[PDB]
Amino acid sequence: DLGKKLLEAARAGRDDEVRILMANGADVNAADVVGWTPLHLAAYWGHLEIVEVLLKNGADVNAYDTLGSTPLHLAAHFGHLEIVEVLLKNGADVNAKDDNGITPLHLAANRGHLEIVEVLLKYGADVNAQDKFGKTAFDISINNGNEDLA
Amino acid sequence: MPNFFIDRPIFAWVIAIIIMLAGGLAILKLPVAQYPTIAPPAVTISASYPGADAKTVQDTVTQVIEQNMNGIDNLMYMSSNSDSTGTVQITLTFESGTDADIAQVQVQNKLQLAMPLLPQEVQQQGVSVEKSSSSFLMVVGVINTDGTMTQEDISDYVAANMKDAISRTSGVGDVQLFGSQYAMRIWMNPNELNKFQLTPVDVITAIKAQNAQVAAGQLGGTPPVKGQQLNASIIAQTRLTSTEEFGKILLKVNQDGSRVLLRDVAKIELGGENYDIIAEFNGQPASGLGIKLATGANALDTAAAIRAELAKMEPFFPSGLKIVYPYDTTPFVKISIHEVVKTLVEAIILVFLVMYLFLQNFRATLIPTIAVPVVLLGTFAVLAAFGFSINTLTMFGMVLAIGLLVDDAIVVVENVERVMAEEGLPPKEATRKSMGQIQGALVGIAMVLSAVFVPMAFFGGSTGAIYRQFSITIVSAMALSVLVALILTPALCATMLKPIAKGDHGEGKKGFFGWFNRMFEKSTHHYTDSVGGILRSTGRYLVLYLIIVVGMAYLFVRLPSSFLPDEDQGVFMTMVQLPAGATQERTQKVLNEVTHYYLTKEKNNVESVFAWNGFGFAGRGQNTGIAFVSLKDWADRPGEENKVEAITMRATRAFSQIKDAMVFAFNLPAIVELGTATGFDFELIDQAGLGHEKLTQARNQLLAEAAKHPDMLTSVRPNGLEDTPQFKIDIDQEKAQALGVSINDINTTLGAAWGGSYVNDFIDRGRVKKVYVMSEAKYRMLPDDIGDWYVRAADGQMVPFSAFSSSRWEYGSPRLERYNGLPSMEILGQAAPGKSTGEAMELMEQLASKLPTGVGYDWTGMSYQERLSGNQAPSLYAISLIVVFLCLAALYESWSIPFSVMLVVPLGVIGALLAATFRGLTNDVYFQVGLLTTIGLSAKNAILIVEFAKDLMDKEGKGLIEATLDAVRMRLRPILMTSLAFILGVMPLVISTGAGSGAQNAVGTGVMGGMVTATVLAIFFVPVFFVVVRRRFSRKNEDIEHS
Amino acid sequence: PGADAKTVQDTVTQVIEQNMNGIDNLMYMSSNSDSTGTVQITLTFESGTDADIAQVQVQNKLQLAMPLLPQEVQQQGVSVEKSSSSFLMVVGVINT
Amino acid sequence: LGTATGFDFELIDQAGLGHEKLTQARNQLLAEAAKHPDMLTSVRPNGLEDTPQFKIDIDQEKAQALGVSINDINTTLGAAWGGSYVNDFIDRGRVKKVYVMSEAKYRMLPDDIGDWYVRAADGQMVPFSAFSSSRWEYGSPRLE
Amino acid sequence: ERLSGNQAPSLYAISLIVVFLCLAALYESWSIPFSVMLVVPLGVIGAL
């Protein structure tokens, strides 16, 4: 029925049709074949307002895909600062590890987001957490040559 | 020239027979096809990268080729798509008239300079360059009814034993095989590999070493030693030939001495080169051939020969191998020939009738029965001299010319009958006098009609190619008709007509005919009395004319216009698209449901369903497919409800209830090679440093803004595919370096296992084929299977993939689109109900201009023809007006009298516009050509009316009014005779239902109404036209007679 | 060089032949592969076929298949010639 | 044009037959035609008859055991008995080819096969006789 | 040969017809042409 019409409504960024589908009792926590929830879609693509309409409607803020990644992982990887904040303000695990042991700090530190790193650090991001290769967020920065993050 | 042939009627006969000989000869030898070359020449570059994704394909293949596509002549535009099946196609479209062979050679020459820069995997797969704008001649399907063959087994028999003798058949050019020949499939096992400390690298190296062919020289080889006695070829290694020989390939002799054979780490079977396409004919596995007509080849003779050579193979078939034919244009063509010939032969009959009704002797009915076929046959010889073929447009151009060829025969015979009646002259001396009355006008009519139909042939693009088919056919038949009217028919009038006593109008005959002659004598008197009456107050009817003109304008601006009528072609299409990530097995159930539908709920109508799982018309992928529905014969589908249009609506409606998919059915356009016709074709282009993501953005912007003008655009949407989730896997360069595991060992292990690897060639039953290594399916499906693959370090330890790699989920395109070398997304769509497509584009242009900076746009396909061809029709027909006036100015020796003829133009046009608006048809190419033929016939009537009146004042001294009523009295019977036969002859076309009736309705309705009002109005209006014009431009003493 | 008739036919002749489709006015095709490591593939066209058009379509098709020939065959140079012309003269060269 | 006189016939293998089953049916057709000398005369092949060829087999097990690589074997045999285009030199300003090939006397008879050695990975010279066998067989010197 | 045997009869049937038609035009008669066409075998036998 509507758990499907919601994932695509959340991938498209269609606010009212999300709001209409939440009114139609569509599952906030529906997931596709790779485990991505409407919050996963809205965090990946950068839709703040649907992150706000889903979370206000009881969307699992710490949902993880079939590889262990969370909406904060996507939002911190891809620069959606406001969504990194809105996810974190609603109880997003700031130190969550995927099946590779990668944290939203690892992701944001890779691409050079300096703001999202600080927002994660404030919300208790483990500076010394490690991936499956022993690397931390610092090791990433000296690798990238980003003197600011270092 | 007539007089020469009145005196030599056997000479005139001999020329007619020779003309008939060349024509019937040309018919036997001329190419026959549904349509000539209409779509602009297109060349397609195809390349395949096994296991590669859309991005990898585009960025190692597509861009490399595109950057070398300059210095090519007559190129209109270039477009390409690279998809996740490792397939890239680059189509180059050239101007209409470009030599297709010259275009392909310049493409191939340019594509070549770039071959050294493509990956070896792409080069080894073979980059093809083909002419792709040719249409399909037929589609052959191959099944096994004993159920003993998978589609790969069928596909291999087709390639090895069928495909090549088909490419050899008379007239065929370009054949596409559904599937591939056999490939030696090495299905690897990762557990067994790790347990012996082997990788795919060691497998590939073993096949490349033990499946090889060796040049080994000769015993006694040259230069030999003195006194050598033996010379023999040294045969060292030969390609392997079977699954067993591949099975015992020695991979490794173990420590204890045990041998690691290839069958000890892999299953080995003959399979397909590729498994992305599932092909089903009525739910059964199938392979087949898509066959195209070679340029300028006889479609009738090519299909008939093809069906004979498959019949020369069927004994040598394996048991149960059955040939089937889901598509073949040959029957629809033969029905078209039959219908046009029937229209011609029965239009001849209707003329013999109307001849016998008005002239009442079996002797004058014979003359048009001879002249018309002589012209019809001879037209084919003219078409051969200019390189044309027998097709739908040329055959219909000949029926649209029937009214003009018939009038030439009527006007000549009727005038001899009248001169004999009104003057008692003998047939020979009357024929001489009658020809002196009309031969100057007939020549002048030939020039005027030339100026009407010749400008058509200079439109550009695909539509100009269509008009040119009618233009050359009609002018040729017309020019021949006049020649016959000056050579044969006067000779036939003088030698076959019996004398008529002076003053004898048959008013004293008995029965039906005598009643007829008296009544027509009365009606003529009423006509001239009327026209006498209308001529007394002409300002009243000059206003009536102004109303007919303004009304014709209003009807023209209100009538929608189309390209070519849709035809029930006996086949149609249904397309299937599942959401992203959907698998091959999910789409199959849908196609099995779409299949199952047709062979049950449409049991009477559908003959077969050819389903393809893997490619659709939006792109390629596991989540797409189509089903080709071949109907039963039109004869067994009587009624509206059993036509393709009705069958396609009931299909789409019942596929609304399908949940896992999204399925429509639709008819084929009349010209399938062109497609399109309806709507526009738009391209959104990244012109700065934007990306696929910023481009899909601006597309959705444009798509949403267009959806907010549903008064203007409807059904705007993409042509391509949406982003799908893809498995991004990263190699840690530091760890792989630490564990001593080389990157090259990693990438060929991953690629060959999950994507497959062409290794080398083996030899299957004497025919060279490919060898593929690839993981067995079960070990390469889910991300957890990634861990079960090991790579050898330099020290010798097996290191699992998990020890040097990470991975996430991300989104990516399964089909990237480029236009003219830059990233693009194609956006289709059409104009709203009652709106022009020309103004639908202007909104699309305005919407696209508000898109982000760096995003541009361009029009393509059918739309690109419009944007550069709207200025044409006004100028072209302004040239037609001027030459027509000038020719009439020459015929009449006056600058003003031409105006009396040209004003008849709207008289027939309003009838066509009324009959079209009544029947709810469209301004289409058949309607426009019928407009010209209607306008030409009305102009012929007005020319002869005006010429008779002017000659009465000139050579016989009568005044304006006596000559006007006199001329229009002599012209009443010929004008009515032609129109009665023509209007009656276009009768079966207007009511036509069934195959071909789309075009038949189109040429019938407009011509019919145009014929009716032209004759009703012009008989009254051109007598007004001549009088009012002759009064404004005059100088002295013209209302009164003179010596 | 050094190859036998079977090796020549099955690494060269068949590879080229399978790519000889989509060529206009082709009447028939024949070839021989012999123990001198030499292969010759003759394509004969209808009378009146433009010889230059025929050769170009042959060369264009033969080319797409060059990446699939052994390096030893590519390095020797695959020639494509019009062969139905007759001999004008034969020059011999000797040293007395 | 050549020809003019007589006919020109082709016998074709259209199923999975072989050169051997084809030469068979040819000799069948040739013999039956020779039994109509009232009708056909001088029917015969245009091509060549099968000739004895030296089939030499490499033992994959031994060459693997002696550490001698197959690639070292095949380029040693081919370049010695068949010759190998290597690269280009420059003769009096004109680029020409460079060919390696055995001197004639060491590549005439099957006994000369033994006098060729290949280096193993360890460094020992292994003669051809230590990893190969051979027989006589028939084969076509010109396939049609 | 196999694709060109049907040719000589038709081609020279066309030659006969056009020759007759031309003579029919020259003489203005359908019969007098026959008086000319019958000379054909007179020279053919000498060549044979």
Report the structure determination method.
Answer: X-ray
Largest CA distance in chain C: 53
How many residues comprise chain D? 144
CB contact under 8 A, B14 and E29: no
Residues of chain D neighbouring C2 (CB-CB closer than 8 A): 78, 81-84
Please state at what angle helix B997-1032 crosses helix B905-919, rounded to 10 degrees. Answer: 150
Q: Output DSSP code: residue B162.
A: I
Chain B hits for D55, Cβ within 8 Å = 235
Q: Is the Cβ pair D144, C30 closer than 8 Å?
A: yes
Task: From D78, C57, A110, select the one nearest B216 (Cα to Cα).
Answer: D78
Residues of chain B positioned with their CB less than 8 A from the CB of A32: 581, 725
Omega of the bond prior to B223 within 30 degrees of 0, cis? Answer: yes
What whole-number distance in Å separates Cα of residue B309 and Cα of residue E7? 23
Measure C66 CA to nearest chain B CA, in Å: 9
Cβ contact (<8 Å) for B808 and A132? Answer: no
Which residue, among B112, B117, B113, B60, has the nearest Cα to B86 in the 3D structure?
B60
Give ∠ CA D34-D36-D40 in degrees, rounded to 5: 75
Catalogue the E-assigned strands of B52-159: 75-83, 87-94, 128-131, 136-144
Name the 3-class secondary structure at D126.
Answer: strand
Q: Please list, in sequence order, all residues whose beta carbon lies within 8 angstroms of the beta carbon of residue B442, skipping any fewer than 6 positions away.
A: B408, B411, B482, B485, B486
Size of interface B-E (CB pairs under 8 A): 22
CB of A76 closer than 8 Å to CB of A93: no
Nearest Cα of chain A lies from the Cα of B715 at a distance, in angstroms, of 18
What is the β-pairing status of strands D51-58 and B232-235?
Answer: parallel
| Maximal CA-CA distance, chain D | 72
For residue D46, give the chain C residue with the closest CA: C32
> How far, in Å, CA of B718 to CA of B826, rounded?
6
Q: Is B750 in contact with B757 (CB distance < 8 Å)?
A: no
Three-class secondary structure of residue B313 per DSSP: coil
Contact criterion met (CB below 8 Å) for C62 and B129? no
Tokens encoding D127:
């003669």
- Angle value at C-alpha B821, between B820 and B823, nearest 5 degrees: 100
Q: Around Cβ B843, how many Cβ atoms within 10 Å?
A: 17
d(CA A43, CA A63): 12
Closest CA–CA distance from residue B808 to any residue of chain A (Å) = 6
- Tokens coding B847: 């919407």
Distance of CA B432 to the CA centre of its chain: 50
Residue B936 · residue B1019 · CB < 8 Å: no
What count of Cα atoms within 13 Å lies in the side-chain half-sphere of residue B275? 15
Q: What angle do CA B825, B826, B827 make, to 5 degrees?
A: 115
- Which chain E residue is nearest to residue B11, measuring alpha carbons? E25
CB B828 within 8 A of CB B715: yes
Do E28 and B10 count as a contact with CB atoms less than 8 A apart? yes
CA of A8: which chain B residue's CA is closest?
B579
Resolution in A: 2.3
Q: Using the beta-carbon criterion (under 8 Å), do D80 and B212 form an inter-chain contact?
A: no
Torsion sign across C-alpha atoms B859, B924, B628, B600:
positive
Distance between CA atoms of residues B663 and B672, nearest Å: 21
Contacts of B92 (CB under 8 A, 6+ apart): B42, B43, B44, B45, B69, B72, B75, B78, B103, B107
D70·B214 Cβ contact <8 A: no
CA atoms within 13 A on the CB side of B187: 13
C-alpha torsion sign, points B1014, B1020, B1025, B1030: positive
| C26, C35, C64: residue with CB nearest B128 | C64
Please tell me the number of Cα atoms within 13 Å of B483 on its side-chain side: 16
| DSSP-assigned states of every residue in chain C | ----HHHHIIIIIHHHHTT--S-TTEEEEEEEEETTS-EEEEEEE-TT--HHHHHHHHHHHHHHTGGGS-HHHHHH--------SPPS--------
Contact C34 D53 (CB under 8 A): no
Rounded to an integer, what distance in angstroms lies between the CA atom of residue B442 and that of residue B944?
Answer: 9
Q: How far apart, in whole angstroms, are the C-alpha atoms of residue B104 and residue B117?
A: 21
> Which pair of tokens denotes residue B155?
């596909």
CB C1 within 8 A of CB B212: no
Helix/strand/coil percent split, chain D, to 5: 30, 25, 40
Exposure class string for B582-612: b at 16+ Cβ within 10 A, else e = bebebbbebbbebbebbeeebeebbbbbbbb
List the 672-711 stretch of B: residues with Cβ below 8 A of A: 700
Q: How far is CA C76 from CA B6, B12, B929, C60, C70, in A?
A: 76, 69, 61, 19, 10
Answer whether B233 sits within 8 Å of C60, measured CB to CB.
Answer: no
Sequential DSSP letters for B246-282 = HHT-EEEE-SSS-EEEGGGSEEEEEEES--S-EEEET
CB–CB contact B112 C63 (8 Å): yes
| Mutation for testing the B interface, residue in D56, D69, D85 having most B CBs under 10 Å | D56
C-alpha B310/C-alpha B164 separation (Å) is 11
B in contact with A (at least 3 C-beta pairs within 8 A)? yes
Tell me the domains of chain A and their CATH numbers.
3-150 (1.25.40.20)
Contact (Cβ atoms closer than 8 angstroms) between residue B567 and residue B995: yes
Which candidate, B778, B771, B741, places its Cα nearest to that of B756? Answer: B771
For residues C15 and B1013, give the distance between their C-alpha atoms in angstroms, rounded to a whole number: 69
- Which class for D121: exposed (0-12), middle (13-18), buried (19 or more C-beta within 10 A)? exposed
State the Cα–Cα distance between residues B254 and B1009, nearest whole angstrom: 93
Nearest CA among B1014, B1002, B1018 for reference residue B930:
B1002
Q: Tokens 């002017």, residue?
A: B950
Chain B residues whose beta carbon lies within 8 Å of the beta carbon of residue E21: 14, 17-18
Tell me which residue in A12, A65, A131 faces B809 most closely, judged by beta carbons.
A65
CA distance B81 to B91: 9
**8 A C-beta contact, residue B77 and residue B820:** yes
* CA dihedral for D3, D7, D13, D14, sign (positive or negative): positive
Residues 6+ apart with CB under 8 A from D76: D116, D118
The Cα of B619 is separated from the nearest Cα of chain C by a number of Å equal to 25
State which residue of chain B sits closest to D78, comparing Cα positions: B216
Residue of B nearest to C25 (CA): B171
Q: Rounded to whole angstroms, how far apart are CA atoms A39 and A90?
A: 12
Closest Cα of chain B to A129: distance in Å?
Answer: 16
C-to-D residue pairs, Cβ atoms closer than 8 angstroms: 43
Q: Considering only alpha carbons, which residue of chain C is nearest residue B291?
A: C22
Closest CA to B762 of B215, B213, B263, B272: B213
The three-state (H, E, C) secondary structure of chain E, written as one string? CCCCCCHHHHHHHHHHHHHHHHHHHHHCCCCCHHHHHCCHHHHHHHHC
* Cβ within 8 Å, pair D78-C2: yes
Pairing type for strands B218-219 and B232-235 reads antiparallel
Token pair listed for C49: 């076929």
